Design a protein around this motif. Sequence first.
Motif, PDB file in Angstrom:
ATOM      1  N   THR A 207       9.032   2.026   6.163  1.00 15.17           N
ATOM      2  CA  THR A 207       8.494   3.121   5.393  1.00 15.17           C
ATOM      3  C   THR A 207       7.032   3.389   5.706  1.00 15.17           C
ATOM      4  N   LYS A 228       6.184  -6.163  11.100  1.00 10.79           N
ATOM      5  CA  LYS A 228       6.842  -6.323   9.807  1.00 10.79           C
ATOM      6  C   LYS A 228       7.931  -5.259   9.675  1.00 10.79           C
ATOM      7  N   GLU A 232      12.029  -5.615   9.723  1.00 12.18           N
ATOM      8  CA  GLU A 232      12.696  -5.111   8.540  1.00 12.18           C
ATOM      9  C   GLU A 232      13.923  -4.317   8.950  1.00 12.18           C
ATOM     10  N   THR A 357      12.434  -3.506   0.499  1.00  8.74           N
ATOM     11  CA  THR A 357      13.023  -4.580   1.289  1.00  8.74           C
ATOM     12  C   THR A 357      11.942  -5.644   1.544  1.00  8.74           C
ATOM     13  N   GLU A 367       4.012  -3.450  -0.727  1.00  7.99           N
ATOM     14  CA  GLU A 367       5.330  -3.200  -1.290  1.00  7.99           C
ATOM     15  C   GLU A 367       5.205  -2.480  -2.637  1.00  7.99           C
ATOM     16  N   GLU A 370       4.477   1.010  -1.590  1.00  6.02           N
ATOM     17  CA  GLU A 370       5.751   1.532  -1.079  1.00  6.02           C
ATOM     18  C   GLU A 370       6.652   2.024  -2.221  1.00  6.02           C
TER      19      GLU A 370
HETATM   20 MG   LIG Z   1       9.964  -1.392   3.327  1.00  4.11          MG
END
Ligand SMILES: [Mg+2]
Lengths: 612, 622
Positions: A207, A228, A232, A357, A367, A370
């Motif tokens: 993302t 990362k 993912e 995730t 995160e 996100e």
């Molecule tokens: Mg993600």
Amino acid sequence: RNLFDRVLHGQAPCFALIARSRAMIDVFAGAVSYPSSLAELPLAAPTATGADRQELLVMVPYRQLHERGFKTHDDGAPLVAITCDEHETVSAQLALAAIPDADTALGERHFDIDDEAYAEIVERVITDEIGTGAGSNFVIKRTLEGDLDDYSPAKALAVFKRLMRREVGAYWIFVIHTGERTFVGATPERHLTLHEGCATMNPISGTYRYPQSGPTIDGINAFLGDRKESDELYMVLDEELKMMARICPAGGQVTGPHLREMARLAHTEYFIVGHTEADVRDLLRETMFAPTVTGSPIESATRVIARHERAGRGYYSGIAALIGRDARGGRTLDSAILIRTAEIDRAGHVRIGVGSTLVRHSDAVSEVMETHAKVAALSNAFDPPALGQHPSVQAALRERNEGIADFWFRPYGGRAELSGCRALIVDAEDHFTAMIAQQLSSLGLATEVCGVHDAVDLARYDVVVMGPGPGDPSDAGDPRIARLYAWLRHLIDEGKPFMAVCLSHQILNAILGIPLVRREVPNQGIQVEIDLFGQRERVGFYNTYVAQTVRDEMDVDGVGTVAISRDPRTGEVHALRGPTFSSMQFHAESVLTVDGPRILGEAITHAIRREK
Amino acid sequence: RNLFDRVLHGQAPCFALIARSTGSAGERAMIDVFAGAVSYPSSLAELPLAAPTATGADRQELLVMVPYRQLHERGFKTHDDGAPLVAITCDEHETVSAQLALAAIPDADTALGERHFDIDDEAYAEIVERVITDEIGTGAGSNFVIKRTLEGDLDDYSPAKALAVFKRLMRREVGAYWIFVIHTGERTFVGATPERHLTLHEGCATMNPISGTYRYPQSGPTIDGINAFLGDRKESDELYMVLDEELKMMARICPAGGQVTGPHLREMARLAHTEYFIVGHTEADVRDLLRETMFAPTVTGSPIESATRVIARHERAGRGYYSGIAALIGRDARGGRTLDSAILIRTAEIDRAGHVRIGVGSTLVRHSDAVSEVMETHAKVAALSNAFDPPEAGPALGQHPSVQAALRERNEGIADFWFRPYGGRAELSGCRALIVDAEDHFTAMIAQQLSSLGLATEVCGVHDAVDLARYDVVVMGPGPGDPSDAGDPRIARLYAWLRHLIDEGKPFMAVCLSHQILNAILGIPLVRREVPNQGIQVEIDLFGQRERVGFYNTYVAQTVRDEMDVDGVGTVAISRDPRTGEVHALRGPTFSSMQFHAESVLTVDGPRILGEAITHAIRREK
Ligand SMILES: [Mg+2]
Ligand SMILES: [Mg+2]
């Protein structure tokens, strides 16, 4: 009255609008039931009618995972099945124009688990689960909460509307209303499609959060180079390959990856296709739920989810499935993952699940950010996020009216010494004369306008006004300019009171032997503070040529002594006062002149001085 | 909405759609929809206008397009390009809700081909400098507008395409006085003009001198930008000049003269303007008022007659309808004259061929800077131009070659197998395998790959009871958890399987979790990796051969030994990281194992590696 109009006017207690793939919206209505299992979905025996037909719209809740032996926090969310008794398509643009707007502002809007709390949970999952071999990646939900006032489905229609107009890159944009529960959302991810035995999945993960100012090429590249993020995606690819290996005998085939661009963020994605002839109920059961919204390995992910989420999931991470038949009786499945979606209850209380995730190199604050980016478009769809109305601007506009002509702002209705006096205004091809007439009129003069070549009886007037115009005043080869020389020579000779303006002021200067020069920087449309015979005035200029002299008074044959108002530095002449006349380089009538009428009155009063 | 649908299906050959400003605050936008007959009067005197009549309701009579050429009616010079006075009788008139209308208008490719300015930036700048030096600088006047023309070709031109441009204009542009499309049969007009020319309602005449232009940055307008603009001397003089000039015009048509209100900032999509209003009273015939107000100083200059002289001197081409008037002439509910007219700027003329002309100029003053005036013309044409060729229509960020490349890279150096067509894809040929699932469906992927090597395969669970005589090799699968956790019933059961396989000398291949357990059974220590290897590709030495493999593990076996003798087993060979002692794989007398996932999308040449594991495990069989 089509189905969509019936839906619009509350005549359909149970309905769905689904914008899939002119863009068309699918419009469904029919009967609700809540069967006890996926086995028990009310599906008829095969039939081919000769066209594609949808049979059931199904909402599978997270708790349905009991059918797989997996543990969930059981919140009683039913398996919903809506029979597609009626089904029409309407043009997306037409539909949206029909949908009335509404206040859909979310009251007492907040996350059930706040940022600090969510960050601690993220860290814990990484340390204690991924870090103890529970698996490689996990999704932990939290929930954006809020209250709609005076809730009815019309409000959900309004949110659907804004979603359609503002969000992009969605797989489905929809509003599904069951009677007791409404779903509105813009999900990017299919769950499982099935057409002529061809099954497809769409593991999406990774993302890129768009800056407030908009996405950039640099931003995207830096994202596409993030280890990362890359890991993912490979991880959910792998996980979905396992799923496809189970439902498809020959396994899946990957294609991609692609960059899915949405309104507030972009995602990386792959596609997996394979062949299967399993019953749709089995396929649904066996694919509950995508790893992109649970984790991996899946059974351990459900365990991890139960350990770290105190609440049940509702329909978050669940499936909305359109089950149907092709022209020839073959099974069809179009299904989407219930993420980026609001559940609204009869009271108007709104729940929006969102997670991310979590991977071994996840950073907790990212995160958190996100999750905000993911809910952002839906959230804007509820609560959408002037220079003229700014007080700096209002102030600067108001300043434009300070220190200019009051006259022209006064109501055209209500706006001795000279009262009764008759003036003739001679037009030199510049309708400034019409403005001069209005101002003289306001002083009590009766006024008449004519042209330079016109033949006039100069006994019917007390004062003659020689108007402005274009051109060079030294240009006696212009017939109009030569004509003005003739007028002024005649007025001077006869001793007739006159006032020369601009061009004619200039000509008069030539006739009196004062030099004309061209200004290097022209004075064309400029307000200037000047000494006008010992009084500061602010006046408007519209001239390029100017009379220039060193002398403050000049004695001229056939005239007498003429007083000259000039700039002492430059010698530029602003005005003349003669024995029987006055003149002005500037325009008293202009919006750029302060107290124009007064100035003209003083000019006229002077010009008629030997009369009495 | 029948007049509108008829317009939509070609059934009104001559029509106008005009979105006007009227509308009260909290009302839907409405579009006025006109149709009737085209005529071409020879003069304004002869406009087809009936004697006064009242119906009790407002009624439009005529829609008139006055070309620049018409200035001959005032004795002013003009390049005569034949542009006729066009008059369309408002035989039918309906109104539709803008949103419904716009939804009904089909989209179209309206990309302008062979798009160019007739006078380019360098050329136009030279003309600007000339005007300032030779005209303003010789006393021709104070300000002047010099036109140039944005040009292009629409392919497969029909009016539907004009409807498309009107549509985008309605969607995108703001602060317009009129947004319109007018189609006469032989010529089509589409535009978004900010400036009324002249309105008339119950004797009340209004004009709107606009000048001064703030060009929005590509980033968007700012408060600082606006303030800097509102403090610019050039710009504020520009507006005062045009104010003075329109005041003269109002002084001529209105006996008592004009009254100023303002100023205001008009905000549009790509630019903002400063503006005033002037109102006054008049009872002149509409034809006289149109004649005497040809044309606004904001689009000609001043003084007017000299401006036309200057314009003629510096423009090769005639002007068409650029700077002209579009006039709705009508009656109020009781027979009084009504006028709504707009200045034809920010407008396209399209001919029957598809060829498009968009006139644009700028008000030139003594302190104009020529390059700014160039940029100003671009900003003015920008909304309209975008209505033809939108920006969003251009290529996606995703299609950028850096992105296309970085996506493509994701497929380099990973598993070819999973990208191969699914149906699709000596020595192990007959061989029957049993795959024991430890709660990770990686087993289904192992099955597929083994299958591709020619093995027959079966998957079962750890607690299932099987007859191992039915198989040649057993694969002990991966799963979650800690391999040292023999108090977990599932884990206990894996230990039991492996002890049993080893003891029986049954060929087996242990993967990940089971590989780890097998290490425990052989006495090799297990540890938690400080940094877990969960979802990672790593280059390793696998029994003397560089491989790139996919890991999904947190715990690992560790040893200093490259080979070891183990009681009840034999000699086991160990592939390990020579720096850290991490074990990647075991090769025993009757078995093989792997910490990594050969089957993963992260493993290069997985099937080969599996085949070698299997080939090795069965080495004592015949
Ligand atoms: Mg993600
Ligand atoms: Mg300008």
